[PDB]
């Protein structure tokens, strides 16, 4: 029911920032019952909740609803929302590889 995908996002510079062109929800500090994208409503994982049309994530193949398992090898299955955000937005990293699962 879930298929593994590997995407390689090349961030886009927007002013001082490097951006990925998507949004995330979830995390072990959040209420998993409110995540509309998961199969199991106790799943506290990080999910892609929106993708910017024409942005880096879209070009790389990311899709709304994808569950993020790893970012550049870092486990994303049991992290807080803020930890996930920080891992995805390291200013020093222009390329981020995401391991995701897709229903």
């Amino acid at each position: 029911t879930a298929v593994v995908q590997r995407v390689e996002i090349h961030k886009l510079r927007q002013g001082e920032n490097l951006i990925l062109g998507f949004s995330i929800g979830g995390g072990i500090d959040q209420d998993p019952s409110q995540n509309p994208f998961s199969e199991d409503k106790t799943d506290k994982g990080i999910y892609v909740t929106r993708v910017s049309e024409g942005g880096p994530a879209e070009i790389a193949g990311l899709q709304i609803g994808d569950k993020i398992m790893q970012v550049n090898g870092w486990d994303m299955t049991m992290v807080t929302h803020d930890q996930a955000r920080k891992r995805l937005t390291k200013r020093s990293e222009e390329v981020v590889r995401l391991l995701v699962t897709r229903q």
């Binding site: 951006i19 998507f22 949004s23 995330i24 959040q30 409110q34 509309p36 929106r50 955000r85 995805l88």
Partner: peptide, 9 residues
Amino acid sequence: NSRFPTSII
């Protein structure tokens, strides 16, 4: 959803 915060990155 107010109870499903999301972050833009």
